[PDB]
Amino acid sequence: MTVDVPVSSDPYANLAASYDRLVDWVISEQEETPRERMGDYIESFWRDQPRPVHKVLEICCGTGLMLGDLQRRGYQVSGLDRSAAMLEQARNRLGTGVELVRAELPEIPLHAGFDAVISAANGLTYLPGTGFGETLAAVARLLPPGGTFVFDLYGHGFFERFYDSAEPRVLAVELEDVSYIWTFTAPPSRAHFDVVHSQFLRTPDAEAGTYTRTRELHRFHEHTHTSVRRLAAEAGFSSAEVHDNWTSRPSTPESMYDTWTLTRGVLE
Amino acid sequence: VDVPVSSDPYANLAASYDRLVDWVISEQEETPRERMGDYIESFWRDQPRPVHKVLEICCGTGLMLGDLQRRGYQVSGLDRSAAMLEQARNRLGTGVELVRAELPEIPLHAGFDAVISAANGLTYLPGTGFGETLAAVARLLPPGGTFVFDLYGHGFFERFYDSAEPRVLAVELEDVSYIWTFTAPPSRAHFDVVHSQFLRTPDAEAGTYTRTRELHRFHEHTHTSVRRLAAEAGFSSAEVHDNWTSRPSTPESMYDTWTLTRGVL
Numbered sequence: 008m009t010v011d012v013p014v015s016s017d018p019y020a021n022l023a024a025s026y027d028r029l030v031d032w033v034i035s036e037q038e039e040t041p042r043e044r045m046g047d048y049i050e051s052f053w054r055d056q057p058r059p060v061h062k063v064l065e066i067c068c069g070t071g072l073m074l075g076d077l078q079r080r081g082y083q084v085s086g087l088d089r090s091a092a093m094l095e096q097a098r099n100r101l102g103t104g105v106e107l108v109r110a111e112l113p114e115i116p117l118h119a120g121f122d123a124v125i126s127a128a129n130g131l132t133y134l135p136g137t138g139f140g141e142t143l144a145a146v147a148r149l150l151p152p153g154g155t156f157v158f159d160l161y162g163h164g165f166f167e168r169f170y171d172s173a174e175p176r177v178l179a180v181e182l183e184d185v186s187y188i189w190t191f192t193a194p195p196s197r198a199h200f201d202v203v204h205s206q207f208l209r210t211p212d213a214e215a216g217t218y219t220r221t222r223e224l225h226r227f228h229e230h231t232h233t234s235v236r237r238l239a240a241e242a243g244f245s246s247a248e249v250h251d252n253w254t255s256r257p258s259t260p261e262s263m264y265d266t267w268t269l270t271r272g273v274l275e
Numbered sequence: 276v277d278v279p280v281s282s283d284p285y286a287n288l289a290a291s292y293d294r295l296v297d298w299v300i301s302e303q304e305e306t307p308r309e310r311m312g313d314y315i316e317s318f319w320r321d322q323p324r325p326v327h328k329v330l331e332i333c334c335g336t337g338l339m340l341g342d343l344q345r346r347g348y349q350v351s352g353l354d355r356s357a358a359m360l361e362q363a364r365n366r367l368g369t370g371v372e373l374v375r376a377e378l379p380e381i382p383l384h385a386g387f388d389a390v391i392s393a394a395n396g397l398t399y400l401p402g403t404g405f406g407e408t409l410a411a412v413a414r415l416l417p418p419g420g421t422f423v424f425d426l427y428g429h430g431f432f433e434r435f436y437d438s439a440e441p442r443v444l445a446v447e448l449e450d451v452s453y454i455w456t457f458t459a460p461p462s463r464a465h466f467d468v469v470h471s472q473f474l475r476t477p478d479a480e481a482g483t484y485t486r487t488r489e490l491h492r493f494h495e496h497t498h499t500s501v502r503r504l505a506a507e508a509g510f511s512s513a514e515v516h517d518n519w520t521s522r523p524s525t526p527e528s529m530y531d532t533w534t535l536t537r538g539v540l
């Protein structure tokens with residue numbers, strides 16, 4: 008339909024069952040960092056901090072790809088996501104002993120503290136500026152002095168790559184049992200950035216060649232370096248560094264993904 | 276999942292083709308039929324013999340023929356696709372002669388003042404059938420009669436077959452979504468596009484689509500080859516320009532427009 012696709016309460020509800028396979032493709036062809044290398048970066052940062060990390064929360068934990076990596080390294084992990092469908096996959100991966108809470112950021116209905124909080128593979132880009140700042144504030148209240156918060160965002164280069172003309176760009180891939188078509192549009196103001204995620208899955212109990220299309224609107228926000236630094240300071244983080252895509256290289260106007268390392272200050 | 280060449284690659288596309296052409300025009304530099312007709316008419320007005328009877332081979336759904344019909348020419352069409360010709364018969368009416376045949380066969384029993392082929396149908400012919408088609412067209416024309424057609428230019432093959440991984444292009448249109456995958460063998464003897472098409476399923480609940488996949492197999496005919504085959508067919512002149520303009524053709528051209536003139540016997 009040429010008419011606009013509305014924003015659903017859970018844009019991942021139809022994707023959760025095929026998400027892990029799609030991640031494999033984004034890692035191969037769209038520079039997304041493997042969760043093992045994200046974990047290596049996170050652990051290296053933690054090892055530079057004076058307080059040891061044991062309890063870890065991931066917000067926007069999705070199907071648990073990042074949490075599963077940390078579980079295998081020996082951490083006591085917990086997850087939060089707004090999508091029941093994603094969390095069902097995470098439950099299968101992590102087992103029944105891991106706490107997984109369904110909540111929509113900036114709400115974090117957890118009272119006990121964590122030694123560290125993370126968010127991998129760009130979930131925080133779904134938050135508008137106001138809710139992003141409130142999420143940083145909520146994460147700060149879970150951390151002790153010196154505790155860390157490590158997350159990624161789409162970098163400036165992502166927005167310039169996929170929103171560079173009045174005419175929308177289209178990206179597609181055909182995988183074994185699913186075809187995806189992504190159409191990227193943004194308002195003239197560029198206040199947010201939309202992707203229509205069209206997914207074609209074979210229709211069960213139907214003649215060969217039959218597919219069911221579902222469409223979901225994924226609405227992204229660019230959080231600039233200057234805004235992230237301001238909101239981190241407001242939330243009570245005494246330092247905030249950014250690097251290019253889970254490496255030690257500087258973040259630049261070309262970066263496709265930015266990786267933020269925040270340290271909680273000493274004022275409660 | 277490999278796709279073979281169908282006898283009619285356009286059978287599943289004919290019903291959606293005119294709308295797809297609107298998108299190619301707005302995004303892939305295909306020339307509107309009115310501007311192709313303008314170019315053709317300007318070329319004809321440089322010839323000493325007036326043009327009235329016009330045949331288009333690879334006439335498809337009749338978009339080019341409809342433009343010339345509007346201008347007053349007596350038009351005829353040839354295409355191998357019954358599905359495409361059904362659309363052409365709707366646009367042009369029942370009085371226009373439309374013949375189903377696969378080039379190089381042209382089963383017609385009278386000549387034309389001019390022959391055309393618009394929007395790159397002749398790129399589906401390999402070298403041998405392309406040369407035989409030029410020979411068949413020459414035999415429809417009087418001395419000095421002209422043949423105007425387009426081909427994919429060198430820039431098209433460079434743009435879509437240079438990457439280390441096969442290029443994928445896509446769009447969602449009205450009731451149909453397309454994914455195109457561009458591959459070529461190492462020999463580069465031909466150039467393939469797999470046309471993966473999701474078309475709404477009639478009488479099914481909303482969101483049901485039927486996928487069909489068609490192989491479109493293209494050939495690059497170099498300028499040297501075209502001039503050689505034009506000479507062999509009996510054309511005395513053969514000029515090439517960039518995409519239906521008077522600008523010269525270059526290695527960067529996406530579309531080449533050929534203007535051939537039949538020689539004297």
Ligand SMILES: Nc1ncnc2c1ncn2[C@@H]1O[C@H](CSCC[C@H](N)C(=O)O)[C@@H](O)[C@H]1O
Pocket residue numbers: 019030042066067068069070071072073087088089090093110111112113126127128129130131133134
């Ligand atoms: N406001 C919000 N509150 C909670 N979860 C959110 C959210 N906005 C997006 N998400 C979640 O962000 C996730 C992004 S996909 C990333 C999943 C996982 N971290 C991984 O490494 O693969 C989705 O599961 C989505 O449901």
Ligand SMILES: Nc1ncnc2c1ncn2[C@@H]1O[C@H](CSCC[C@H](N)C(=O)O)[C@@H](O)[C@H]1O
Pocket residue numbers: 285296332333334335336337338339353354355356359376377378379392393394395396397399400
């Ligand atoms: N060998 C062949 N013989 C006859 N028609 C052919 C052919 N190879 C390709 N075609 C036809 O070439 C057409 C290309 S599409 C172009 C259609 C029309 N000239 C227009 O201006 O839109 C299709 O209709 C296809 O069926």
